[PDB]
Design an enzyme around this catalytic site. Structure first.
Site, PDB file in Angstrom:
ATOM      1  CG  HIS A 142      32.683  77.321  46.681  1.00  0.00           C
ATOM      2  ND1 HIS A 142      32.426  78.506  46.027  1.00  0.00           N
ATOM      3  CD2 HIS A 142      31.598  77.068  47.445  1.00  0.00           C
ATOM      4  CE1 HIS A 142      31.228  78.943  46.368  1.00  0.00           C
ATOM      5  NE2 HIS A 142      30.710  78.095  47.237  1.00  0.00           N
ATOM      6  CG  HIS A 181      27.363  80.705  48.383  1.00  0.00           C
ATOM      7  ND1 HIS A 181      26.701  79.559  48.765  1.00  0.00           N
ATOM      8  CD2 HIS A 181      27.084  81.639  49.318  1.00  0.00           C
ATOM      9  CE1 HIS A 181      26.065  79.788  49.899  1.00  0.00           C
ATOM     10  NE2 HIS A 181      26.291  81.040  50.260  1.00  0.00           N
ATOM     11  CG  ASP A 267      23.193  77.893  48.158  1.00  0.00           C
ATOM     12  OD1 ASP A 267      22.857  78.093  46.946  1.00  0.00           O
ATOM     13  OD2 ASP A 267      24.354  77.624  48.511  1.00  0.00           O
TER      14      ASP A 267
HETATM   15  O1  LIG Z   1      26.607  76.788  49.585  1.00  0.00           O
HETATM   16  C1  LIG Z   1      27.815  76.599  49.677  1.00  0.00           C
HETATM   17  N1  LIG Z   1      28.517  76.450  48.584  1.00  0.00           N
HETATM   18  O2  LIG Z   1      27.889  76.768  47.407  1.00  0.00           O
HETATM   19  C2  LIG Z   1      28.605  76.623  50.989  1.00  0.00           C
HETATM   20  F1  LIG Z   1      29.790  76.037  50.806  1.00  0.00           F
HETATM   21  F2  LIG Z   1      27.944  75.869  51.879  1.00  0.00           F
HETATM   22  C3  LIG Z   1      28.866  78.110  51.429  1.00  0.00           C
HETATM   23  F3  LIG Z   1      29.500  78.441  50.359  1.00  0.00           F
HETATM   24  F4  LIG Z   1      27.643  78.467  51.600  1.00  0.00           F
HETATM   25  C4  LIG Z   1      29.697  78.014  52.671  1.00  0.00           C
HETATM   26  F5  LIG Z   1      30.780  77.564  52.094  1.00  0.00           F
HETATM   27  F6  LIG Z   1      28.828  77.335  53.349  1.00  0.00           F
HETATM   28  C5  LIG Z   1      29.761  79.402  53.141  1.00  0.00           C
HETATM   29  F7  LIG Z   1      28.594  79.937  53.467  1.00  0.00           F
HETATM   30  F8  LIG Z   1      30.346  80.099  52.220  1.00  0.00           F
HETATM   31  C6  LIG Z   1      30.672  79.240  54.343  1.00  0.00           C
HETATM   32  F9  LIG Z   1      31.891  78.907  53.925  1.00  0.00           F
HETATM   33  F10 LIG Z   1      30.223  78.266  55.091  1.00  0.00           F
HETATM   34  C7  LIG Z   1      30.714  80.465  55.214  1.00  0.00           C
HETATM   35  F11 LIG Z   1      29.486  80.805  55.624  1.00  0.00           F
HETATM   36  F12 LIG Z   1      31.186  81.335  54.353  1.00  0.00           F
HETATM   37  C8  LIG Z   1      31.644  80.233  56.405  1.00  0.00           C
HETATM   38  O3  LIG Z   1      32.171  79.128  56.482  1.00  0.00           O
HETATM   39  N2  LIG Z   1      31.858  81.235  57.285  1.00  0.00           N
HETATM   40  C9  LIG Z   1      32.794  81.195  58.287  1.00  0.00           C
HETATM   41  C10 LIG Z   1      33.178  82.418  58.845  1.00  0.00           C
HETATM   42  C11 LIG Z   1      34.160  82.487  59.829  1.00  0.00           C
HETATM   43  C12 LIG Z   1      34.802  81.333  60.274  1.00  0.00           C
HETATM   44  C13 LIG Z   1      34.445  80.104  59.727  1.00  0.00           C
HETATM   45  C14 LIG Z   1      33.456  80.037  58.748  1.00  0.00           C
HETATM   46  K   LIG Z   2      26.582  80.875  41.445  1.00  0.00           K
HETATM   47 ZN   LIG Z   3      26.213  77.752  47.874  1.00  0.00          ZN
END
Ligand SMILES: O=C(NO)C(F)(F)C(F)(F)C(F)(F)C(F)(F)C(F)(F)C(F)(F)C(=O)Nc1ccccc1
Ligand SMILES: [K+]
Ligand SMILES: [Zn+2]
Ligand SMILES: O=C(NO)C(F)(F)C(F)(F)C(F)(F)C(F)(F)C(F)(F)C(F)(F)C(=O)Nc1ccccc1
Ligand SMILES: O=C(NO)C(F)(F)C(F)(F)C(F)(F)C(F)(F)C(F)(F)C(F)(F)C(=O)Nc1ccccc1
Ligand SMILES: O=C(NO)C(F)(F)C(F)(F)C(F)(F)C(F)(F)C(F)(F)C(F)(F)C(=O)Nc1ccccc1
Ligand SMILES: [K+]
Ligand SMILES: [K+]
Ligand SMILES: [K+]
Ligand SMILES: [K+]
Ligand SMILES: [K+]
Ligand SMILES: [K+]
Ligand SMILES: [K+]
Ligand SMILES: [Zn+2]
Ligand SMILES: [Zn+2]
Ligand SMILES: [Zn+2]
EC number: 3.5.1.-
Lengths: 375, 369, 375, 369
Positions: A142, A181, A267
């Protein structure tokens, strides 16, 4: 088969501030009595423990690596980003971005993670191993050049590829990203490039939230060298198999990679809190078998799997074990205790057919001819 | 509105042996460094903590209850089952069934959980409150009369209904089960009965694994008085709203319940490990509003929500808070920090339409269109 | 007896960054898989849970309070300290001093903790209750006016006393500090004052490390109005009983307090990692009985116990329960399951005699006449 | 110097039922939200992690071993004890004694722990290494032949010695037990023997509770070949140094051991919840140096250190690291972050002098002055 396992214990010592799953503690989010963060060490540590007690670690070529130099990192990131990361890391940590929290010493550990990825590509390109697995924590896929996202702080795979091009002059690398993701970092970096085919299988709209990306196929020189497969939430084994057979394998066939790198998050597994897909350990086994096969036909067997996401403590170890068995050609005595159960939860025929038709239409949109794998 | 909150701290002290999520530790399953079980206290404790910090607890009628008597339990479960449960509980715990682990003292605590459910129905039927929420841990909706399943050891809701019928003579109770898993315990107990309409919204094939159940509508006297809505995995807000509007509300309209009981698990939430659905806290708020409305129209407002499943530590509290705000008519300062994010992840138009068409067909099959 | 229990759930939501016991994570200190910090919520939460299931909470007068105003806090701390605390708290937390880590929102929660202490003194002084217990997390007794120390961020008891003097004009308050560490914050603030008698029982040289302090008895107007009892590490029940009878009770007798405040840590308990003393729940019961008695004879029964330290998750609840039983005059069915065991581990006769002789000499050094309690 | 590190990941997978520190969960003891037992894997795992991150593992001779055979175990424990242990392990675990809880598969893992101890002695006696460290979890030194105690289920060291005598015919082994608790298992087994000198440094009256044992010096053939040094609670570095110099080194000098085995718990460390002593990592370094020296002088360098107790997650790794640095002759970059702090907390001069006088008297009593 000779598989290198790039691992360092110190990657498991990176730890952010208190979080409830992915939510930073504060406001209405109470501190958890145990947990602490989503990207915790435990998921990777339990993979390592299962590898040890299964006897698999004894059959791998176990390696560490130096951390990534400034030279290597600067091919992707700017100095002011390194400096900002480092200063925040030396002052005890905090928030380096949206969903990008770091702890004290995280800069050094992120560098180590990136070095493992660099070294894994190097080993495979140099003929030191047929293939490799890099247990790179923290993850990478990411991360943008000047923006930390999604718990990634360096673009591990992009840094590894740019280093590989400088040392070995490899001309065509394919990055298959099966983390559930969207691999937005790899996509953006290589978006106008045809020396890197980036393919992302992901849950439609999961992360980044609301993004599908099927029409984002690259631009100018890179047009046709980026492919997004936004799978419907709820999909499992068949959805992934169909995506592999109708999109991925034909795309790799057209691209003729000299190296395949897999951004392997787990995941998409059936019990992950961070997505809604239904994969079991044999699903990851089968995807690895398909990608290994593609590597044997185009790339002299040159395959590197870099660990990305996967939050489930209980089930990630079994999924990661399956991959490494398939890379090494060694089948342990481990039996996945959720396998039969996850089989019974799969989408019904009507849902499978509905997802299959969308993948057929998508393969046509991409202009992928349904040819059969050959050499 | 006067909402009774049935809660006892002691329900949070029930704890099984070591598990990794739902997997009993042993063989290839390493002991977790922290976690312990799926059905942990933390998810329910954090709901209670958020209720307290929000100031909402101060607006509820806080109650406990005596544990369920042998009389009450025996309306559903046989004496030999009570004895077997108790003996295993006295000897430090272990496995009472398939996915049914207990700890030391779990018998007593299960009885307390069941008593809260009994007391919540009683309070609402007696006019002591307009509605009620029972934080009943351990949960109940998978438990058969002689077989513990799915971390349920007594059929809490069934035990509460049978007790209610004996004490008040209520003739028509509807049980809406929006736990993401199939309410097989309630379905089996009331399967040939028309005094209890059992409806289960659940993820198709999740738990019990491979079960959908749309064709299982009850038999003989109970034919038409059981309804299963097996939603496709990956579904979220719209799927549930469509299910409510096309199946649930028409079914309740036809049945004319004098009491509505909700088996409210929150394991349909978008970050739950134990299923694949995409609900946010406003989804549970909306379902509660729709069921409260149905209760106001047929049942003199008599609605009881019994806590069932929900594994996510982080997000169950926000979903449970939403329900209780809706029951009480009180909106706190709490803002759900995942809400906007879960909106963006919802099924696309094509997937929504696909699930909608299936629900239309199903509502026709059931003769509710 | 009518006992007020000042408690707020939100005090249990304060959480620092990752620590292994008291060591900040980083360098050679690996992140713990569960724990997270020494001053964790769990120790206080389990006290609250045991109070609930024992039926004791139902017999107390359960109260919360507004958080401490700027007015109240400024009587002790400077504005620039408040501003620094707040800014660090709004930027996700970090290190406010030596052994003084804070999390996001910790400023607000520290204010709430301080308000509970303020309110507990107010209630008892106003005749709303005979005595009170304040479950004030985070703790207070190490905090200096312009320096956070020992996980304390406001000087809770000093802030409460200064507020009490402004509202009620109380002229003589005694602070007995039986937290196993030295109450340096209270000592320094009141050091040249005779309106506040500060007494610290502590393990010799524990925290602050290397400090005993017997010769530090106050200065000028405050000479003789501060008393340190540095007990030898390894001491338990008898050591504390002798300290109470030869130093504390005679000192209170001389001072004639109108209010007694207890800085009650439970980290002198026999299984605490953060010190080496051997107290059981009946030891804290007996100290509370002695101090309650002193309050009934001088202070119209006005006694406030403010929760300070105590790290043991398993055993703090039983020690804190004992105190509150003794304050309320209500004995629950709870039976301390470590009691008999801790009895058998106590110092032998020779060691007891050696500590007793030192306390006799110390009482003589202080010029304390061995009189008997009276009214 | 060539140091063998006997370790198996599987030893870290042994896990009892829920405990709060050492208290079995139940009655008034609430289940912890995270922790679990005292004898947790984490303390040993973090020692292993710090060895790896320090680069010190790369300088050791890393070994595993087969689990202990029935033959080996039966030299100490009766068949009915093995059977009882095994049956309880097959049925998910429970309580094998007073302070002796086991989990599922704990029988097999206890056997593995014992095998590491056996193999470590064997390696050193066979000339495969100059010395060895066995990370044997679960621990051994409290376990009697037919009674599990103190979280020990096999008498690891006794089993290793008896196996060593059968395979190599070693005639004089000294066991120095610096776990903060009393090594009652080793004391009882070798109590009437002069081929094994058992010495226990321990906190007076800690565990077993109320036991000092200075007068218990062995009987008949073993009279004089068991020595207990009950140190006053609160003691630290100097107390241990004085005990080593006035009792332990003279006793070893008199006994002329052909092999030294150390029962090395780290629960004398300054932050351990399970005792009240004040040792830092350099204290364990110094004791190891003193015992290594004794081994070089009498035993051809043959020294084995077997991991016993130590509960502190944070600080055990630094104490164990210090020992292994000292065994190997390799000093890593690791700096103990509590070291300077624990110096300042040490007993004052008056307390040191008091403990010193007692140790002088005791050394006279033993006829070692
Ligand atoms: O698996 C991941 N990367 O491949 C991960 F980074 F862990 C993710 F992408 F799953 C994440 F980054 F964990 C996520 F799920 F995208 C996330 F960023 F954690 C989330 F779930 F999107 C997230 O952080 N959601 C939030 C929503 C509102 C406020 C804070 C966090
Ligand atoms: K992917
Ligand atoms: Zn992921
Ligand atoms: O939410 C529940 N009740 O409303 C639930 F019972 F907890 C469940 F349904 F979520 C469940 F019990 F967790 C479960 F899903 F049924 C389950 F039991 F966890 C499981 F997923 F079925 C499960 O534990 N499966 C296993 C399969 C093989 C081996 C061990 C466990
Ligand atoms: O009980 C307490 N206050 O009464 C306490 F604050 F928790 C403490 F005082 F025990 C302490 F503050 F916890 C402590 F023990 F004093 C301490 F500060 F935590 C410590 F143990 F002294 C400590 O933090 N030691 C360190 C040593 C070196 C580097 C960092 C921390
Ligand atoms: O360090 C040990 N072995 O070297 C130890 F056995 F773990 C112990 F001695 F520390 C011990 F077992 F922890 C213990 F101290 F003996 C003990 F068992 F924990 C205990 F302290 F004795 C204990 O558990 N006491 C209890 C008393 C009453 C009820 C439950 C437990
Ligand atoms: K590209
Ligand atoms: K349901
Ligand atoms: K029915
Ligand atoms: K003190
Ligand atoms: K003073
Ligand atoms: K010992
Ligand atoms: K002997
Ligand atoms: Zn459920
Ligand atoms: Zn303290
Ligand atoms: Zn010990």
């Amino acid at each position: 088969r000779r598989t290198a396992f790039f691992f360092d214990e110190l990657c498991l010592w990176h730890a952010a501030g208190p979080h409830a799953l992915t939510l930073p503690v504060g406001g209405w989010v109470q501190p958890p009595a145990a947990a602490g963060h989503a990207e915790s060490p435990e998921t990777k540590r339990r993979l390592k423990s299962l590898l040890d007690v299964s006897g698999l670690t004894a059959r791998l070529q176990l390696r560490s690596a130096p951390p990534a130099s400034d030279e290597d990192l600067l091919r992707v990131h700017p100095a002011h980003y390194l400096e900002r990361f480092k200063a925040l890391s030396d002052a005890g940590g905090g928030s380096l971005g949206q969903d990008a929290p770091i702890g004290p010493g995280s800069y050094e550990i992120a560098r180590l993670s990136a070095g493992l990825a660099i070294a894994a590509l190097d080993a495979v390109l140099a003929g030191e191993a047929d293939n490799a697995y890099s247990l790179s924590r923290p993850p990478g896929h990411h991360c943008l050049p000047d923006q930390a996202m999604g718990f990634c702080f360096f673009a591990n795979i992009a840094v590894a590829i740019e280093a590989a091009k400088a040392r070995h002059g490899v001309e065509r690398v394919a990055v298959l990203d099966w983390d559930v993701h969207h691999g937005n970092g790899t996509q953006a970096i290589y978006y106008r490039r045809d020396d890197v085919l980036s393919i992302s299988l992901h849950q439609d709209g999961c992360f980044p939230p609301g993004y599908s990306g099927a029409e984002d196929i690259g631009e100018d020189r890179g047009r046709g060298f980026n492919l997004n497969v936004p799978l419907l939430p709820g999909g499992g084994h068949d959805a992934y198999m169909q995506a592999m057979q109708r999109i991925v394998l034909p795309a790799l066939e057209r691209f003729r990679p000299q190296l395949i790198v897999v951004a392997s998050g787990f995941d998409a597994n059936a019990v992950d809190p961070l997505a809604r897909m239904q994969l079991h350990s044999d699903s990851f086994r089968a995807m690895t078998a398909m990608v290994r096969d593609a590597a044997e036909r185009h790339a002299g067997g040159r395959l590197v799997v870099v660990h990305e996401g996967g939050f489930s403590e209980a089930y990630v170890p079994f999924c990661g074990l399956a991959v490494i068995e398939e890379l090494s050609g060694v089948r342990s005595a481990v039996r996945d205790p959720l396998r039969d159960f996850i089989e019974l939860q799969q989408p019904n025929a009507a849902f499978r057919d509905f997802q299959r038709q969308r993948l057929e239409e998508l393969a046509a949109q991409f202009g992928l001819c349904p040819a059969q794998p050959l050499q």
